[PDB]
Design a protein around this ligand. Sequence first.
Ligand code: HEM
Ligand SMILES: COc1ccccc1O
Length: 403
Amino acid sequence: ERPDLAWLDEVTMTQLERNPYEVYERLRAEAPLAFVPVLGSYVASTAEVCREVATSPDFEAVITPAGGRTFGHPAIIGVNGDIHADLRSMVEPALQPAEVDRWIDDLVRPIARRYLERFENDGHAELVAQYCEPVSVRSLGDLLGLQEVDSDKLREWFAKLNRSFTNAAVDENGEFANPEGFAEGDQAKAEIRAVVDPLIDKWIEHPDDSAISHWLHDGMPPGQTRDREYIYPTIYVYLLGAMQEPGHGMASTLVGLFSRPEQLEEVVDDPTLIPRAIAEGLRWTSPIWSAAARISTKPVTIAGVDLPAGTPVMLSYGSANHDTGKYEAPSQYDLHRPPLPHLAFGAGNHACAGIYFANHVMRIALEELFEAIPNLERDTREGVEFWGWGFRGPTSLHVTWEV
Ligand code: HEM
Ligand SMILES: COc1ccccc1O
């Protein structure tokens, strides 16, 4: 429909998943808000357009079509009004900074040590599967009340929900081009129900200090609980992004540091620099790269485009965090970049609710790793591939150390 962008017709889902950067570099220059045919949606590629859409009074929350097919209703990321207010009040207590500070160290640090103890003397490791992912899911899983769900299973669930949620390709008629791509999402949800339904049964009659027990009971009249069908979509929100992204953030940070060996040494020498390294890592490869969206509630003009009411816009925060109007050489990792606002946690009233928790999980994990293996080296016999358009991170991170 937009003639000068006819090249967008030839962009593929696989290309966006393998490497979205060239297409989005072109988008940021030619059309900060652009309809991408294979995604079937407008996409916002620049920091200005992403932040405007995420905070605009003329936009409200929505899930991308494949995300809605995966999570259903009411997922906290895609609802508004009183429902959203209730779901926010539901998840917020255990994420409050003063509360996190009470227990985050006794939570994450023994978990990090346990996973490190399995390989820290091996001299070689694949840190995504052996460390970054297990620490992320074990920390959150224990907080939720899923202590007895093995980290292998939690990692499998977030991988299947990832692929279902991002099964976004549409054909010439706007229909999903890969309809069998949702089946492993459906299978993951079926497995989650068989595991979590008996836990919910128990928590209803015998509440405890797990987060999910508090989702059932907090703020309810005496003897009442939130119906499980009302909270499961937000459980799924957690079992995808909240489980996956701290691991993505850690690993992308390590990859960025390895690309600046002078800066990796600095951080290992002075671990007070770990929060700064993580912040740049999230800017450099944003874990929730283009999974979020908003929908317009009235006619609105964005980046010169007159959008009718009811128009979805995908928020490609990962591209926004490479906006060359904001950063110098944003494709390069630079620990010493001046700290600026970034959009890796989103913006607006649907901005990330778990920032403080997530940053601590990533910080403690990297502190323990560098203490256990100060001579960590990237295994340059293998290259690092990143995968994902909706959610993005390294598929593996092979490392060595002397020893
Ligand atoms: C580095 C790790 C993480 C990153 C980069 C991240 C990023 C994001 C992003 C981009 C969104 C959508 C924001 C928007 O649409 O504008 C989001 C939403 C959310 N995240 Fe985080 N997230 C991370 C970890 C976590 C963790 C560990 C939790 C929970 C313990 C969590 C809880 C939530 C919740 C509840 C929402 C929904 C907020 C709402 O819709 O009102 N996140 N996150
Ligand atoms: C925090 O988890 C998510 C955020 C945005 C989209 C999907 C998620 O699971």
